[PDB]
Amino acid sequence: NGRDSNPKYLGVKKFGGEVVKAGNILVRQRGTKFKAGQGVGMGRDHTLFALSDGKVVFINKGKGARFISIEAAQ
Amino acid sequence: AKDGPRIIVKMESSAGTGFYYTTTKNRRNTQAKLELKKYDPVAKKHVVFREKK
């Protein structure tokens, strides 16, 4: 049939290496796809956001071991 | 949000008087036992009166 609906825009907003601010969105994905690490929060929609300004970094080995974290600069 | 003759309802809150409102959606599905809950008005805080009508 002809009934499919809407874009939904899920993604990884700030990729590893990037300098986040406080309140920026790091990932948009569906349930758990990335786990919130050090310095990273998570909302209703999941969707990790930045707790503290700094540099974003990706950490994984396998499975659900994916993690997003922040660290400061100075 | 739409409304009809059917089950559940929209029900307002009590007098935190203050003459005040809350209005959470409710249901007659479980029971007609009415209701009372805790909320805060202009006056004070947590003045807890009964679901109306």
């Binding site: - | 949000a1 929209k10 209005t23 959470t24 959606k25």
Partner: protein, 59 residues
């Protein structure tokens, strides 16, 4: 115009145009979130070029 008079589209010092917030307004609200008491003053100047000549005597 007479339309934006008691309505939104307020001009400011910089000449920028002030918009209110719509959803929801006096009906069909229900639900939960703050957001009810969260419809305030707002704006964008992209459309606003066309809103100046609609009512400028006042701000």
């Amino acid at each position: 115009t007479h339309k934006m008079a008691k309505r939104r589209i307020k001009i400011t010092g910089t000449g920028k145009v002030m918009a209110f917030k719509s959803g929801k307004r006096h009906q069909n609200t229900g639900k939960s979130g703050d957001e009810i008491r969260g419809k305030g003053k707002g704006f964008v100047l992209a459309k606003a070029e066309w809103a100046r000549m609609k009512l400028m005597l006042p701000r």
